[PDB]
Structure 1
Amino acid sequence: VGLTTLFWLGAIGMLVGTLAFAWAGRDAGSGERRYYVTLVGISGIAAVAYVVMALGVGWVPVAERTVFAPRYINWILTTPLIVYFLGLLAGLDSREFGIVITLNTVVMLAGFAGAMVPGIERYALFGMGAVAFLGLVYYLVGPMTESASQRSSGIKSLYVRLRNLTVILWAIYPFIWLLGPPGVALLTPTVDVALIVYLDLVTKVGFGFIALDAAATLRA
């Protein structure tokens, strides 16, 4: 397979999620609709980003490697929606939501800026992203879990399951940054792209399917 084939696979998997989430969503109440819409934005945006890369756009040369701008741009746009979805489940306050979205955005911006820096100082930017990510994990497993524990059993149960998926899989991305083209380039561009397609698909579409499966059991 080539890079563009993998990008096409990403785009299609994301489209399948989006379609599934949109249609599952025709069945929802006032308080439920926001969850389905959020899943549609997450996978819909990622679907378009993958089309962009597949069409050969945003392949930025950085020294002797290629970093995919749409990769990082779509994370910047979609990860706050994932955190938003989780914060809705947890029953988060206005202020604490601002804190997690900020931390999230620092991670994504730092990783994007780092991928763009040819010199060794890109690792300092990575480092800042990594520290912010640890702060993010703390909120997810600490304060946000405390808030979620006050909700109904079905909601608490979905939060913990999506929280665990999120915490474990999001922790893998920085290692791929370090081992792939942005870091020491031990992963080929193709393997790097395949892993991120898979990871993007699970953290968005898998996440969504898990939510769809629980939501159906709760209301009915």
Structure 2
Amino acid sequence: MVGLTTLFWLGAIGMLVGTLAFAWAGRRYYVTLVGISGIAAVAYVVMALGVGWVPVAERTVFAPRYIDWILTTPLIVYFLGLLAGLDSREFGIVITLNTVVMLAGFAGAMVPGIERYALFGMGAVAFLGLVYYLVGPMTESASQRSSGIKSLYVRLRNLTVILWAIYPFIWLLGPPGVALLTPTVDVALIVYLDLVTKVGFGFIALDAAATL
């Protein structure tokens, strides 16, 4: 009743609507949000059209998903870094930590043997370091800003930390890991998370930009 392609089209539409909404409201932050959801829109369309479905051993890996993540997640971290007022050196640490997470996940998905769990573990370790920087140094830094900016940062940070922490569990329980969850359920869960961590993220920012 509900196929993989239908789910991909749903993600595509959701990202498209977010993209147009952000572009209009911007008639730096607004341009970043267009990139976050705009890139994801393209990845989902490609996947909806059946492009980039790589067979690996016994499972199917969706390559556009990881290219999406590698480009859009640093933009989310960048957005949060601007809110917190990071110096260009602090940016380098967190964006480097982020890229290690994304690359490790991409590589582990593409490896058929058990070495893929070794790649997954390395992404997990780097993710814990990324969480430390969001909850600590970047929160210290955001404190120096107005009360409204600091409030916005804390809200987006909380959304980001809680939801991003769920992805490694979905990956591990799905086809890439112990292939418990079926591809359809696993995809459905990730489409939901992608939409909330990108389009939901964006709309919470828009809401605060009008409350000024």
TM-score, normalising length from structure 2?
0.99
2:32 is paired with a residue whose SS is helix
Cα deviations by residue, 1:142-169 (Å, 9 ceiling, x for unpaired)? 0000000110011000000000000000
- Tell me by how many angstroms 1:25 deviates: 1.3
Q: Which runs of 5+ in 2 are unaligned?
A: none
- Tell me by how many angstroms 1:77 deviates: 0.6
CA distance in 2, matches of 1:186, 1:216: 44
CA distance in 1, matches of 2:90, 2:119: 25
CA distance in 1, matches of 2:63, 2:181: 18
2:61 is paired with a residue whose SS is strand
CA distance in 2, matches of 1:71, 1:181: 14
- Tell me by how many angstroms 1:67 deviates: 0.7
Aligned to 1:31: none
Cα deviations by residue, 1:179-212 (Å, 9 ceiling, x for unpaired)? 0000011111001111110000000000000000
CA distance in 2, matches of 1:185, 1:74: 22
- From 61, 66, 91, the equivalent of 2:60 is 66
**Aligned length, in residue pairs:** 211
Aligned to 1:16: 17
1:61 is paired with a residue whose SS is strand
2:18 is paired with a residue whose SS is helix
2:54 is paired with a residue whose SS is strand
CA distance in 2, matches of 1:162, 1:137: 13
Cα deviations by residue, 1:79-116 (Å, 9 ceiling, x for unpaired)? 00000000000000111100000000000000000001
CA distance in 2, matches of 1:177, 1:66: 13
1:67 is paired with a residue whose SS is strand
1:112 is paired with a residue whose SS is helix
2:55 is paired with a residue whose SS is strand
CA distance in 2, matches of 1:44, 1:15: 7
CA distance in 2, matches of 1:155, 1:25: 18
1:206 is paired with a residue whose SS is helix
- Tell me by how many angstroms 1:24 deviates: 1.2
- Tell me by how many angstroms 1:19 deviates: 0.8
CA distance in 1, matches of 2:87, 2:178: 40
Segments ≥4 residues shifted beyond 4 Å: none
Cα deviations by residue, 1:96-138 (Å, 9 ceiling, x for unpaired)? 1000000000000000000011011100100000000000000
CA distance in 2, matches of 1:124, 1:61: 20
Matched, 1:96 2:90: yes
Cα deviations by residue, 1:12-34 (Å, 9 ceiling, x for unpaired)? 000010011011112xxxxxxx0
Tell me which moved more, 16-25 or 42-51.
16-25
